[PDB]
Amino acid sequence: PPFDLDAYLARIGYTGPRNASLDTLKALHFAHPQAIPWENIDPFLGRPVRLDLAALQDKIVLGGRGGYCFEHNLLFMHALKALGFEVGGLAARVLWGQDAITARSHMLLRVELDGRTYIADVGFGGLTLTAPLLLEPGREQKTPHEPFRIVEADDHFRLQAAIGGDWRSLYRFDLQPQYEVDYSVTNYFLSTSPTSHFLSSVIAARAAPDRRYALRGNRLSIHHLGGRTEQTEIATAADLADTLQGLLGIIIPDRTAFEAKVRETKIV
């Protein structure tokens, strides 16, 4: 069974030209993270996260749900390939909120356009990129949201975002290619290891034209573009599920089990 490009583009609301241009890459990179939320509902509920194409597009595209980094960026890669882009998988060690050396727990993409290398990443979370970036060290690059830059550190690169007047590192990466089987090993760990916090907390995000929504446990943050950050404490399991399903457009397959676990584990 092939990748259903029509259904994917309908899922993200893209009605533009279908080609392998930079303009198209920019339009898809803006739309995807607004249409499809970042979330860990399945890992939280102990449900398997499948990365194979058939399962991935059933869940996110037909089923209208979201996912976390591997789900987002594998999906995006499938779309970019179907549109004719030259795209490869990469991996990264997360620096945001992180001991000395962290695992390669994140996925991003490289896209080759007329001999130039871009990175793309629609799956990081709170600070998911809303434009592709030129792999050009040192340079501040504007996006439809925050400014980003890539800095060169020995062998590797760090992707940084400008937050509260500081350059903050999201993650570090090299150009080693990665394939689906590599991501499946890391995904198994993140989604099922008792140590992994993707299993024990509720975490979510979604981009919007003039803001980002981000949620960690019982704290909702609305980051207005070039503006204030509104923060809300969420008092109950019920209001947590309301916020996810209403405001963030996130699907909770079993709300009772969800609320039950939230109450059990003292998240609120």
Ligand X SMILES: CC(C)(COP(=O)(O)OP(=O)(O)OC[C@H]1O[C@@H](n2cnc3c(N)ncnc32)[C@H](O)[C@@H]1OP(=O)(O)O)[C@@H](O)C(=O)NCCC(=O)NCCS
List the catalytic residues: 69, 106, 121
Q: Is residue 38 marked as binding?
A: no
Q: Which is nearer to ligand X, 118 or 124 (CB)?
A: 124
- Which residue has 């909120």 as its token pair? 97
Question: How far does CA 204 lie from the centroid of its chain?
Answer: 9
Q: Which is nearer to ligand X, 34 or 105 (CB)?
A: 105
Q: Which is nearer to ligand X, 31 or 108 (CB)?
A: 108
Q: Is residue 146 marked as binding?
A: yes
CB of 76 to ligand X, least distance (A): 14
CB of 72 to ligand X, least distance (A): 8
Q: Is residue 233 marked as binding?
A: no
Q: Is residue 124 marked as binding?
A: yes
CB of 202 to ligand X, least distance (A): 9
CB of 203 to ligand X, least distance (A): 4
**Got the DSSP string for 113-135?**
ETTEEEEE-S-SSTT--SS-EE-
Region for 188 from its dihedrals, namely left if φ exceeds 0, alpha if ψ lies in -120 to 50, beta otherwise: alpha
Q: Which is nearer to ligand X, 141 or 221 (CB)?
A: 221
Rounded to the nearest 10 degrees, what angle do helices 180-192 and 69-82 cross at?
A: 160
- Give the integer Cα–Cα distance in Å for 80 and 5: 9
Q: Which residue is nearest to ligand X (CB)?
A: 125
Choose among 26, 28, 65, 72: nearest CA to 187.
72
Q: Rule CB under 6 A: which residues touch ligand X?
A: 68-69, 94, 96-97, 105-106, 124-127, 146, 163-164, 203, 205, 212, 214-216, 221, 223, 229
By CB neighbour count within 10 A (0-12 exposed, 13-18 middle, 19+ buried), where does 156 fall? middle
Extract the annotated binding site.
69, 96, 124, 126, 146, 223
Extract the annotated binding site for CoA.
69, 96, 124, 126, 146, 223
